[PDB]
């Protein structure tokens, strides 16, 4: 469907100099990567052979923001992405079909990286979800393609029992995604300035540090549901006084129940 | 239509009724005291109902129940309850006069003295120990393919075998095969027999129990 | 019962003779009986005993014999049993199971079934041209009268509806002594729990459970039945 | 059930128990009910018979002398001490079981 | 594991090899081979290499995938699995799991794992009742034989049944040499520090400390791996 020809990740986004707080998770994922593709000699001279990729679960927060950087901060050509919402169709049977044409645009495209997302999708009779997983882990585990190949799990739940178990073959660091800080956000605005026309009149420090709790979620809620609720009477200046309650209830009221 | 085969010491009725059912069986049919898990709830009357009705369908049928020691013990009312289905779909009000079915067990102790009435189980044969005569003969048979060296001496194979079975031998001959493979000699010399029969044996009497 | 086999008695075997008294009485009597009960499957012990009462024919069609790809033989087998039926001699045609050719259905995909229903409104407008100077005597019985269409049910088609949920105690001890009477009986064989229990527990067909009996005394290893062969193939069938 | 006089009354005699029950919780009153056995219920009442039984479903023996529209032996149970209000699991009353105007005279002979 | 590893590799090796007694003079190679034992071993990327090693056709094939959400296919699987094998050229095929459909429950009321292993009984219809065996092997490995099938007492059966006595350091170094022995490695191991620190740990344990050691390896910048990097994933993982 439109999925194949759509399934490219242009329009590059968030980048690194723009971060969400990761200091060493970023860096944990990160070496895996950036680094491997830049210096590929170090690791296959080195030893064993490099590292496959790292594992990500835990509460949404920021997720998708260090995809972002990943695709933001591609050297040469972006990797190719794949969600779990296009498994789960009508006329069951499609994935490995699916599974194949993508393994086969993967090898056309000199054996790039894969991202999947939302796991949980079709994770947790699932025969043909055990045919899909275990056409990636056997076609991925040769060493015929290349070495060099990076799988993403992204999952809100751990329930995924299959895979968490099938996992410690292949694929390690089983980690949280990303804690959120404090400081980090003014940076996440610094490339929302590139987003629309937020008035000059509003300070990035007074809007930083007036929120407690704000998570890239919440924070995305700031910026989002600001302006949307600027939108609301369709007005054409958006000022911090104008959206202050959108703020503050944006915090608080989503603040009560969580 | 039945028959007990109670082999305590030894054992030997598997090289039997594998070598008749493995010769014709007239068809195939193993039932293996392994595959009854059975951990569901169960509706398993047209299940019984099912497979005895294949054999009244397919007018020849040899049914082997080899290990029913375990399954027939003198969580168990369930048990019971099957095996009352299995005296009603046996003697039951069905002709049975050209299917045969043969059970093998280990001690003829808790052999369910209801089932060990006749017409389930007709025929009951002990068998006691692998006498001389099979034990040279199955040695003959079992070396004939396989050629020796020219010092041929059989008296140091059998004099060496004391209380073994026929699989038992078959194993310690084999394995004997399988530790001389490994210098791929065309000629197979029998101090290789003494050898790695007796040391082979001697793990036999180890390990035979 | 003594109106069942009396308005059967008077409306089927009274009429099946010197066929000038279905004009010589004006209201010939109503043909349609419609026997019900779904425990067992019945509808055989009355055909037998009118099997052997009456000495005449008896064409019996299971409910489905016409229902195939095609659509011919219906007109020319019911008019076949028609013609010797008023030829030769009144045959009483058995029609068992209409809940197969009965069933509503709206798609065009099963035009089969629809096509041969269509054929059963063309010999139901027969049998609407056959209340005058015919000799017809066609018992229709079911399990099932909640699925049965209206045009079928209609006054002036079925006519007489007998319900028989459960035989009187008296009939069940003539239900069970007209069939112990001629197999092997002894004194462990008694109607009394057996007159008691099949009472309680809405039971038909008690000439075939007692059949599926002999099903059970098969096996010729005991000469005479017992109760644990009436008890089993109570709890059984 | 057989209604054999000298044969219930010498086992009866010999200290038979009259509220004996079977498996299935059904007297001999339930049989000599249901078959019309009006000589021989008297005959059991001769000697101190209770007429309240309770059968598998709960249905007494007046449920089975007026299911088969026994009269003389509705007339006889109620009059001698037949508990109507006993009921079954079907929750049915004798006057209910019984047609053509029988429970009329049964609650007739029973406030009578 | 030279006492069990030589005879194992021996037994999937020449078999390929020495067809030509076994075709002149009848002598029948072990089919079936229990390699069984206390977990962690590394027996399944152990027999894997060495599947690699006998340079034949290997094909995966897991315990619980005979378990399929519809009815009759595993008769389609194990009759294609020897249509495949039957027909294709002399393959090594190695399995895993085999005692969790090989319990002998007391229960006998009804289930699918008693279709699941009837099939399996096809199985040992197809290993035993077929004397051209002589074909392409099945060989398969368990995780424990507390629970073992007793009838599988025949030189085409599970015959080869060799434990894992106490895998201490040396079995763990050796399996990790037969896993790392072409790849860079310092020629400078003893074994004994490197070994004696894992104590108690799992084959993809030990391999998980060498995806450990290609971790820090990119920010060790060196041009081959050392001696400490062992230590170093063992302290650092585990």
Not at chain 2, 178 to 183: E, G, N
Not at chain 5, 11 to 40: C, D, S, T
Not at chain 5, 107 to 125: I, P
Request: net charge neutral; with cysteine.
């Amino acid at each position: 469907p439109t999925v194949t020809m759509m399934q490219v990740e242009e329009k590059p986004d968030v980048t690194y100099s723009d971060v969400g707080g990761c200091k060493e998770q970023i860096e944990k994922l990160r070496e895996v990567v950036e680094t491997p593709l830049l210096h590929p000699e170090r690791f296959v001279n080195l030893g064993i052979e490099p590292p496959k990729g790292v594992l990500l679960f835990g509460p949404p927060g920021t997720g998708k923001t260090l995809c972002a950087r990943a695709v933001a901060n591609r050297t040469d050509a972006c990797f190719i992405r794949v969600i779990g919402s296009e498994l789960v169709q009508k006329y069951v049977g499609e994935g490995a079909r699916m599974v194949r044409e993508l393994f086969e645009m993967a090898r056309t495209k000199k054996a790039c990286l894969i991202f999947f997302d939302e796991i949980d999708a079709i994770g947790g009779g699932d025969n043909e979800v055990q045919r899909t997983m275990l056409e990636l882990i056997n076609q991925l585990d040769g060493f015929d393609p290349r070495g060099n190949i990076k799988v993403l799990m992204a999952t809100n739940r751990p329930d995924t029992l299959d895979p968490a178990l099938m996992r410690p073959g292949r694929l390690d660091r089983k980690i949280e995604f990303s804690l959120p800080d404090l400081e980090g956000r003014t940076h996440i605005f610094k490339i929302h300035a590139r987003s629309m026309s937020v008035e000059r009149d509003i300070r990035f420090e007074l809007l930083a540090r007036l929120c407690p709790n704000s998570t890239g979620a919440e924070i995305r809620s700031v910026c989002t549901e600001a302006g949307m609720f600027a939108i609301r009477a369709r007005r054409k200046i958006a000022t911090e006084k104008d959206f202050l309650e959108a703020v503050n209830k944006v915090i608080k009221s989503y603040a009560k129940f969580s | 239509k039945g028959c007990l085969l109670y082999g305590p010491p030894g054992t030997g009725k598997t090289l039997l009724a594998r070598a008749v059912a493995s010769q014709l069986d007239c068809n195939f049919l193993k039932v293996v005291s392994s595959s009854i898990v059975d951990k569901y709830i169960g509706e398993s009357a047209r299940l019984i109902r099912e497979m005895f009705n294949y054999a009244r369908d397919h007018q020849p049928c040899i049914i082997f129940m080899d290990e029913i020691d375990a399954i027939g013990g003198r969580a168990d009312r369930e048990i019971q309850r099957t095996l009352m289905e299995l005296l009603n779909q046996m003697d039951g009000f069905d002709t049975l006069h050209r299917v045969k079915m043969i059970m093998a067990t280990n001690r003829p102790d808790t052999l369910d003295p209801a089932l060990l009435r006749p017409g389930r189980l007709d025929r009951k044969i002990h068998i006691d120990l692998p006498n001389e005569q099979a034990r040279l003969d199955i040695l003959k048979i079992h070396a004939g393919p396989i050629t020796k060296h020219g010092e041929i001496d059989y008296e140091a194979i059998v004099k060496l075998s004391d209380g073994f079975n026929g699989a038992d031998l078959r194993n310690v001959c084999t394995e004997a095969g399988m530790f001389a493979i490994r210098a791929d000699h065309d000629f197979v010399v029998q101090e290789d027999f003494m050898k790695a029969v007796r040391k082979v044996a001697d793990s036999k009497k180890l390990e035979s129990k | 019962m003594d109106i069942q086999k009396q308005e059967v008695r008077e409306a089927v075997e009274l009429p099946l003779t010197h066929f000038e008294l279905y004009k010589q009485i004006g209201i010939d009597p109503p043909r349609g009986v419609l026997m019900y009960g779904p425990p067992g499957c019945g509808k055989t012990m009355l055909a037998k005993a009118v099997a052997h009462h009456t000495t005449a024919a008896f064409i019996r069609v299971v409910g489905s014999e016409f229902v195939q790809k095609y659509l011919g033989e219906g007109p020319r087998m019911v008019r076949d049993v028609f013609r010797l039926a008023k030829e030769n001699a009144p045959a009483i045609i058995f029609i068992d199971e209409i809940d197969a050719i009965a069933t509503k259905r709206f798609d065009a995909q099963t035009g089969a079934d629809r096509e041969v229903q269509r054929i059963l409104l063309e010999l139901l407008n027969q049998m609407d041209g056959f209340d005058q100077n015919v000799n017809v005597k066609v018992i229709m019985a079911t399990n099932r009268a909640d699925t049965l269409d209206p045009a079928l049910l209609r006054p002036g088609r079925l006519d007489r509806k007998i319900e028989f949920p459960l035989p009187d105690r008296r009939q069940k001890r003539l239900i069970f002594s007209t069939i112990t009477s001629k197999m092997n009986l002894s004194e462990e064989v008694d109607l009394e729990d057996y007159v008691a229990r099949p009472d309680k527990i809405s039971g038909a067909d008690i000439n075939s459970i007692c059949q599926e009996s002999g099903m059970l005394a098969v096996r010729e290893n005991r000469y005479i039945v017992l109760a644990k062969d009436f008890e089993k193939a109570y709890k059984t069938v | 059930s057989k209604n054999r006089h000298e044969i219930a009354v010498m086992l009866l005699e010999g200290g038979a128990n009259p509220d004996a029950k079977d498996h299935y919780e059904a007297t001999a009153m339930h049989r000599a009910a249901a078959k019309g056995n009006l000589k021989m219920i008297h005959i059991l009442l001769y000697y101190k018979a209770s007429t309240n039984i309770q059968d598998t479903e709960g249905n007494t023996p007046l449920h089975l002398a007026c299911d088969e529209e026994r009269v003389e032996e509705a007339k006889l149970l109620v009059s001698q001490g037949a508990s109507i209000y006993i009921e079954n699991k079907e929750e049915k009353t004798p006057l209910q079981v019984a047609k053509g105007g029988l429970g009329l005279i049964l609650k007739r002979m029973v406030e009578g | 594991l030279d006492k069990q590893i030589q005879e194992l590799v021996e037994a999937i090796v020449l078999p390929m090899n020495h067809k030509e007694k076994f075709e002149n003079l009848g002598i029948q190679p072990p089919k079936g081979v229990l390699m069984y034992g206390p977990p962690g071993t590394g027996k399944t990327l152990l027999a894997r290499a060495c599947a690699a090693q006998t340079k034949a056709t290997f094909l995966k094939l897991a315990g619980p995938q005979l378990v399929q959400m519809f009815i009759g296919d595993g008769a389609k699987l194990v009759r294609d699995a020897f249509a495949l094998a039957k027909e294709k050229a002399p393959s090594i095929i190695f399995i895993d799991e085999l005692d969790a459909i090989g319990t002998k429950r007391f229960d006998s009321e009804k289930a699918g794992d008693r279709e699941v292993q009837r099939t399996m009984l096809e199985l040992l219809n197809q290993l035993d009742g077929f004397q051209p065996n002589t074909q392409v092997k099945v060989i398969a490995a368990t995780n424990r034989v507390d629970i073992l099938d007793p009838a599988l007492l025949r030189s085409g059966r599970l015959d080869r049944k060799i434990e894992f006595p106490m895998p201490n350091e040396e079995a763990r170094a050796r399996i990790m040499q037969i896993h790392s022995r072409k790849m860079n490695v310092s020629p400078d191991v003893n074994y004994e520090e490197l070994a004696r620190c894992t104590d108690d740990f799992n084959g993809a344990q030990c391999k998980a400390v060498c995806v450990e050691a290609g971790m820090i390896a990119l920010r060790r910048g060196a041009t081959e791996l050392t001696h400490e990097d062992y230590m170093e994933g063992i302290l650092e993982v585990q």
